[PDB]
Amino acid sequence: ATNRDQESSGFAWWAGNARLINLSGKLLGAHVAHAGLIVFWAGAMTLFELAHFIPEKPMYEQGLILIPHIATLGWGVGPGGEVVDTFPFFVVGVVHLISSAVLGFGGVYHAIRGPETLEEYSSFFGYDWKDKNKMTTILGFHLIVLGIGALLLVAKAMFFGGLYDTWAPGGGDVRVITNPTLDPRVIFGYLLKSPFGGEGWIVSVNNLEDVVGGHIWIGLICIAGGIWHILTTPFGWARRAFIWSGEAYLSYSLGALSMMGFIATCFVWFNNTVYPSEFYGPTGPEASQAQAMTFLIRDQKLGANVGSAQGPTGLGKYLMRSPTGEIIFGGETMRFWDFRGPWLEPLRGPNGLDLNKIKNDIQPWQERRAAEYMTHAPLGSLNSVGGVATEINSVNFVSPRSWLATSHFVLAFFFLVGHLWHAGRARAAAAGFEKGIDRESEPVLSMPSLD
Amino acid sequence: MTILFQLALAALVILSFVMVIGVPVAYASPQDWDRSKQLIFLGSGLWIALVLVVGVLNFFVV
Amino acid sequence: KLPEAYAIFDPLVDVLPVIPVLFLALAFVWQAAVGFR
Amino acid sequence: GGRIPLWIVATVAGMGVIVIVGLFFYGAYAGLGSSL
């Protein structure tokens, strides 16, 4: 057995995957088999979700997280997010579940049967971690693959049916995107926006033309950078800046994945465009706004003058001003005045919420939507009791947004921890002190005392 | 056909179970291995032919 | 629901997503059988 | 002394624990204490 015990490999059983650092064939098998696990879960979960899926309930009432992703891509849904065809969800699950067997077979093959290292079998497939030019070549292949993957989303949106547009005129509907936003002052303008409130960085993207046009820019950037990395070698400043080792490249990815995990947590929590509320439930801000609207509507129907009602503090009970003068809902939801949603935007004028439209133009579909969203706020217990912590058992509800945000915060955090673990270790291992201080040349004993 | 669908799907379930056990036990026994590659080559191509059978017969059963 | 022809595999589908978790556990079984060397 | 491999004992005992705790989690949703 080659490198399969601690004495030969230097790593204990619980650090057992580190025995694969220089065994590229077994390491390839680890990765392909793990890719099979990911594809298996995507397949097995979708089929689980579909087997449980009641078509007459909203998706967010059903503890589904994958079916909403498919519905957002345009498959299976009609106007307002209602499900018209369960069969695309079945196909996505099945095809993932079958492809996981192929990835699983090739992972297991290279892990246990095939050559332990690839460097003798092939010069193209073998690699040294220290071979900087080979590393950029594999990086370049993978960038081209990811860039085509972004263009697939563009292909679906433009030439294969469209995407679910929650902002479409007349209600949410699957809409083909014909004019994506190509202009880089808009696309790269999102990158320069503040992440703070009212701004939201890239999380505030609020139309599918910007989403699609960004993915055009990303696909071409990734293909161009892919080609660039196949044709160049890391410049001198890059070679002096980085650690060039397998553990170091892993650490760099862990830093990147953690950052992406944190961004996804915010995307699912705040964005109702690529995470439509008809599939994922209302956002936290959306439900709080929906409550103020609901009681505005009820109280106005009873005869209340809503623009002139004082709350207990003296601020307007239903309506007040934001710190820049826009007319906004009152109460605690004053914090969420930057919320924008297709059920609320028809009440907004130039100065914010228009009081004449509020008096005259609230439709019954908005009243139903506000009540539905207020009663499906992303608040629930770990045993899936919906509502505040003080609520009784009855409602079985935790919003997908809560499940998705909490999970991805947890994952992003530990991946930050992993980045710090592996980045520190790769630094120490490259400098040669990862196993401890050498008793003969202890560095601190050669230093002058601090005092 | 009606009975042909689930029977071939229950064949695909059964055969996947022989492939899930039998493939790592045959890749990790390199002694009597030339006799096991044929059953791997057979079971692999038989499995792929059953996915296509289930996939084709889905569109007469659904 | 699954397409109605597939309705006998519902008990199998119900347990499919947990199968990845068993792979993690399986690595501990395999290591126990080699004695964690 | 060394009849049954300790890994087999560990695995069956480990799985016996899972089944028993999984039953207790099943009982959280059924019968007494389920809120239904």
Binding site: A1, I112 | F17, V20, I21, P24, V25, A28, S29, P30 | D10, P11, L12, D14, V15, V18, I19, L22, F23, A25, L26, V29, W30, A33, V34 | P5, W7, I8, T11, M15
Partner: peptide, 27 residues
């Protein structure tokens, strides 16, 4: 129905290990 599928799936992993343990496999 559900309890017997998880039992047959839950034994397939340990059976791979046990079968390679008895044939002196490459564990």
């Amino acid at each position: 129905a559900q309890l017997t599928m998880i039992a047959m799936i839950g034994i397939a992993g340990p059976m791979i290990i046990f079968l390679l343990a008895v044939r002196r496999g490459n564990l």
